[PDB]
Amino acid sequence: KVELTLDPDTANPRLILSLDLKGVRLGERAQDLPNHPCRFDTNTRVLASCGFSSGRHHWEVEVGSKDGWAFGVARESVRRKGLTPFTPEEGVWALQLNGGQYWAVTSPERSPLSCGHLSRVRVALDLEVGAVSFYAVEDMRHLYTFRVNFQERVFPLFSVCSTGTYLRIW
Numbered sequence: 001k002v003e004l005t006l007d008p009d010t011a012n013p014r015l016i017l018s019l020d021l022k023g024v025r026l027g028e029r030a031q032d033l034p035n036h037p038c039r040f041d042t043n044t045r046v047l048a049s050c051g052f053s054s055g056r057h058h059w060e061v062e063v064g065s066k067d068g069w070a071f072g073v074a075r076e077s078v079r080r081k082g083l084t085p086f087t088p089e090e091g092v093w094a095l096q097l098n099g100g101q102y103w104a105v106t107s108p109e110r111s112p113l114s115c116g117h118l119s120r121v122r123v124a125l126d127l128e129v130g131a132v133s134f135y136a137v138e139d140m141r142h143l144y145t146f147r148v149n150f151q152e153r154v155f156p157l158f159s160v161c162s163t164g165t166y167l168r169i170w
């Protein structure tokens, strides 16, 4: 349904975006970019260039096998400057691969998923229902849903905090 690209102006300056602005990995060295207000200056995050205020949208995300990624959605007002917590209260609703386990990033304790190995995941954002849902593409098996009372523009969110993993809008 939606054709997203990663917004380079939002990306932490250590992130490396592929030529087509669909893939993201982490570099060791910070690239020299202007510190625009929208840019995440500390946490390893990037948003898509397009966000959603209403309706039902979906996209798919190819995921690395190694630890260090999280993705889902973020409210537009998610803090860009400073070190932020990666939590629903701070405006991020995401799955994560960390410690060899898949998680829904619930607070104050993350929720472990029993879903087996993931390769590509569909993200379904419904702003009339008030939910963001994740499915393993191979059989559209439901992984997790956050129900949320979204009341602003919601952006696709990606984060990569290890040099050994990646995400790709696919």
Ligand SMILES: COc1ccc(-c2ccc3c(c2)C(=O)N([C@@H](Cc2ccccc2)C(=O)N[C@@H](CCC(N)=O)C(=O)O)C3)cn1
Binding pocket: 014, 026, 027, 028, 042, 043, 044, 045, 068, 069, 070, 083, 084, 085, 086, 096, 097, 098, 159, 160, 161, 162, 163
């Ligand atoms: C030479 O090789 C490397 C490898 C990694 C890094 C690097 C650079 C910057 C960050 C980190 C690592 C790092 O871990 N960062 C966390 C936040 C944090 C800050 C300080 C101390 C500990 C943690 C971060 O942003 N975490 C993610 C969590 C979501 C996810 N992706 O799972 C987030 O909040 O978006 C930020 C530098 N050089």
